[PDB]
Write a protein that binds this ligand. Structure first.
Ligand SMILES: NS(=O)(=O)c1cc(Cl)c(Cl)c(S(N)(=O)=O)c1
Ligand SMILES: [Zn+2]
Length: 258
């Protein structure tokens, strides 16, 4: 009875195996744009993906992860609310069964069609495994996806999904440039949170971009053709793998813009 997004193993059930699910700094959260306060103490956000080196893509049973080689000082996120440097390890998405839902964070209660998460770990902790055990161990850059014009830089990801339809399947995914998934503006909201999937560790500094990227209906439709199940099992379409907004618990969401 592994965790998932279904009626009997979904978000409302996670707290049983992962008590922290009802913690003080859980993610995602609704971003109230009027309550978010501009913070002039925020340094410019720095996204350096020029040397990013992807290794492969994997269907983990709830979504798919595009993993990167993080053994060297490449693809780093710094600045903004961050102290030190965070290294890119993987990215994945959360999406819905319909265009009207799919994102984890919401803006003034608005739900986007999907959400891209670029996960980075704080280099001062040596590696990802140790980083997740720290309050400031990870920095996740969140980007909203809306349905409209196609995102050229996403097509390579979309075309390889046919090869990792079911749980446990993986495939070589080299030379993918994450820069092609970034919107024009780096304006963002930031707050202290957690992993949005079990183990739900509260080790994340969330940086959510205000500007969404546009992807075509055809692109997101291919996301929905993935399977939650493994090869040779009853087909359960991989859709609605998002966790709903959690209590803000007095935390304050800071904005990098006015
Ligand atoms: N289990 S996972 O690979 O989906 C996953 C792993 C990690 Cl480390 C993080 Cl931060 C996230 S998230 N949704 O960005 O909080 C998801
Ligand atoms: Zn995520």
């Amino acid at each position: 009875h592994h965790w998932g997004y279904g009626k009997h193993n979904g978000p409302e059930h996670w707290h049983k195996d992962f008590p922290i699910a009802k913690g003080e700094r859980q993610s995602p959260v609704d971003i109230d744009t009027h309550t978010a306060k501009y913070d002039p103490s925020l340094k410019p956000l720095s996204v350096s993906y020029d040397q990013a080196t992807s290794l492969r893509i994997l269907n983990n049973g709830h979504a798919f992860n595009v993993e990167f080689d993080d053994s060297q000082d490449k693809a780093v996120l710094k600045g903004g609310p961050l102290d030190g440097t965070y290294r890119l390890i993987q990215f994945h998405f959360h999406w819905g069964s319909l265009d009207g839902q799919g994102s984890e964070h919401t803006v003034d209660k608005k739900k986007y069609a999907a959400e891209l998460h670029l996960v980075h770990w704080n280099t001062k902790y040596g590696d990802f495994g140790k980083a997740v055990q720290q309050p400031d161990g990870l920095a996740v850059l969140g980007i909203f996806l809306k349905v409209g014009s196609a995102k050229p830089g996403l097509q390579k990801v979309v075309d390889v999904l046919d090869s990792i339809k079911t749980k446990g399947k993986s495939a070589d995914f080299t030379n993918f440039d994450p820069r092609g998934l970034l919107p024009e503006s780096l304006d963002y909201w930031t707050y202290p949170g957690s992993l949005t999937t079990p183990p739900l560790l509260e080790c994340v500094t969330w940086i959510v971009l205000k500007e969404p990227i546009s992807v075509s209906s055809e692109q997101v439709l291919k996301f929905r053709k993935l399977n939650f199940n493994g090869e040779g099992e009853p087909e359960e379409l991989m859709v609605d793998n998002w966790r709903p907004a959690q209590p803000l618990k007095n935390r304050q969401i800071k904005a990098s813009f006015k």
